[PDB]
Symmetry: C2
Subunit: 226 residues, 2 copies
């Protein structure tokens, strides 16, 4: 079966007004790990359209409306960048993070500081580091050496459920979002928390692997697109 | 084990001069199916750098140097767009084609005609269409309903080998390319041919599925990034 949202509806927090954004900044600043996902629209000739930014904590998910630009002003985005993204004491966990950060940086005035990005953890890079083990790594639902590299493969091996890709190809610009869209976007962030916490609890040498992975981060130098 | 290049070295044709490009146009114009892949570099704040465009036929692979812009002039790219990409009598087979075509269109003056793109076949979309079957589809090395959606998953199910991701994260702008880079780029295109031909030969109702897939193509309207 597919991964479902385990949080109560009250813990999925839609942010499309300034007072909601200010409250979110207050809570995010007190966390030491958050989990990043986004939803955006693309075409062959058009500019990318960033629609949703998801920031999960260990206990809730913020769904920020990136099209709400008359209520969410430049200074809001700048402070999200300065206080949270650029804060070396908050670990930002994501998956395939060059793509996510590129769309964010080009769409929003976050002014990300990308030198020495050791406060970002890309689970895709961490997964590849685990696969460098000679005998693999045994997880609750399989060995990393038998798993693929997509986010749904991490979810299967760690949590035992695939990600439901229904509503993946919806119109992320529709307002209000359908319930199925809110759940899909929230799962995209919450599953990173569940995967990360599975590795933290179940892989005895995980801290050495994390340090190697965060050391390999490079967002400023060109790398091959994957 | 991993998929290896089966073609002789002479059938991997590097194109970085005008006379080579003109000869390629002559041969491509006589094909009715070609297979498209590309290699490019990205960073969070920099512009995407298109490095290699791979165009495979059934019997060889062209590796076009997209950085050779003093020898490969605008009219060369325009004629590749007009004579081959925009030619409704040549099927262009690819995988995750919005991303590929977006980088091509923004980097090169191909002037792609994207209305009614029924002469493109995206194997990723075709794969998802096959997964809509109630009982799955049995392929030589597994059922589509047990496979993932990455290109390496199509390769495993159809051909029995994963794609080697060593040299995936190389510097695609280095000249000359290392031998390992030429082979990786050539496999990225050649494997589409091997997968397509496996489906053509082994799935009895494949033509109805192809028609549904090509009908769903839309490159002009915004769609969710996957």
């Amino acid at each position: 079966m597919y991964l479902t949202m385990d949080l109560p509806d009250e813990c999925l927090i839609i942010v499309n007004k300034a007072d909601e954004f200010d409250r979110m900044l207050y809570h995010l600043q007190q966390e030491c790990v958050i989990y990043l996902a986004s939803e955006w629209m693309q075409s062959v000739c058009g500019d990318n359209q960033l629609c949703v930014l998801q920031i999960a904590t260990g206990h809730n998910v913020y769904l920020i409306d990136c099209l709400a630009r008359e209520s969410l002003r430049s200074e809001h985005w700048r402070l999200l960048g300065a206080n949270i993204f650029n804060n070396v004491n908050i670990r930002k966990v994501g998956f395939s993070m060059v793509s996510d950060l590129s769309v964010l940086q080009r769409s929003l005035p976050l002014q990300l500081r990308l030198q020495m990005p050791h406060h970002y953890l890309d689970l895709r890079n961490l997964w590849l580091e685990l696969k460098k083990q000679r005998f693999g790594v045994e997880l609750p639902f399989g060995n990393v050496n038998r798993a693929g590299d997509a986010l749904t493969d991490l979810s299967l091996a760690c949590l035992g459920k695939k990600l439901n890709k229904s509503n993946q190809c919806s119109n992320w610009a529709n307002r209000p979002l359908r319930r199925e869209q809110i759940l899909y976007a929230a799962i995209d962030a919450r599953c990173l928390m569940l995967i990360y916490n599975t590795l933290i609890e179940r892989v005895s040498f995980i801290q050495a692997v994390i340090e190697k992975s965060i050391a390999s981060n490079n967002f400023l130098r060109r790398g091959a697109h994957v």
